[PDB]
């Protein structure tokens, strides 16, 4: 019924992998998503581990279509830094989308919870943060080279495979892009729900979105990462941020942030989109920071 076009191919509900409901076991609730609970689940000795997004049985026609489009979007991506879709279960109620379980949880919570402290002093280092930044930039580069504008790149929408060393960060939420795809604008949301603090001036002023949109948001994600999970523009409201950013105002470096890292942020935040780097360049600059001993030997602040 609705068609979804990505990378010049059109897919429909008929292309999603319908997984038999009998093969799905819910284990525990993990919390609420934008519209519905999310569960840890299993798909069948050595079952696949999945996050299960559910559609409330009490919902509208548009919610049903929002849910379908979310499934179509994530099912057509193919990249190691974008959460995989195992399949769907749309023919039983409540309807399920089955995603690669990201056992480390969302990246914002991880940064807040794993901040170095007196009890666990070496929980994180500068290299961990650079690897997370690289991981997400690789996924953003994949979106950019396939002409997909994410529109909501932010730590809350990224997830980690596992809490400990070896973790890989991935883009896990596409709800903003889904809302725009269906109606062409933020019909579902409102001004108070827009991710103002992640958006460049031409986005919230003219509603113009390009891949240079995501470059700006990635700069803010970089600030979130190197601040260890602080809210951007600490004391400022959405409208204060809007006016601050349009006047040329930019965030200060996070505490202890190395200069070369801060300079990636400020390049992402150039007023003119043409002056911002693409994700190939961002990746080069992240890779160069990872090679620099003065960067990776910088100690993160310990939270008392
Ligand atoms: C053992 O596993 C987990 C254990 C925990 C989390 C996550 C996963 N694992 C996971 N969660 C996903 N979402 C998700 C999960 C819960 C609530 C909302 C969403 S959510 O709306 O999608 C959002 C990410 C935009 C996932 N989505 C795709 C894969 C995947 N894996 N927790 C958080 O993340 C806490 N945060 C939300 C504040 C809580 C502890």
UniProtKB/Swiss-Prot annotation:
Clinical disorder: A chromosomal aberration involving ALK is found in a form of non-Hodgkin lymphoma. Translocation t(2;5)(p23;q35) with NPM1. The resulting chimeric NPM1-ALK protein homodimerize and the kinase becomes constitutively activated. The constitutively active fusion proteins are responsible for 5-10% of non-Hodgkin lymphomas. A chromosomal aberration involving ALK is associated with inflammatory myofibroblastic tumors (IMTs). Translocation t(2;11)(p23;p15) with CARS; translocation t(2;4)(p23;q21) with SEC31A.
Protein name (database record): ALK tyrosine kinase receptor
Superkingdom of the source species: Eukaryota
Reported function: Neuronal receptor tyrosine kinase that is essentially and transiently expressed in specific regions of the central and peripheral nervous systems and plays an important role in the genesis and differentiation of the nervous system. Also acts as a key thinness protein involved in the resistance to weight gain: in hypothalamic neurons, controls energy expenditure acting as a negative regulator of white adipose tissue lipolysis and sympathetic tone to fine-tune energy homeostasis.
Binding residues for ATP: 32, 53, 100-102, 173
Assembly with partners or alone: Homodimer; homodimerizes following heparin- and ligand-binding. Interacts with CBL, IRS1, PIK3R1 and PLCG1. Interacts with FRS2 and SHC1. Interacts with PTN and MDK.
Family listed: Belongs to the protein kinase superfamily. Tyr protein kinase family. Insulin receptor subfamily.
Protein kinase domain sequence ranges: 24-295
Effect listed in the UniProt record for changing residue 77 to V: In NBLST3; somatic mutation; constitutively activated; retained in the endoplasmic reticulum and Golgi compartments
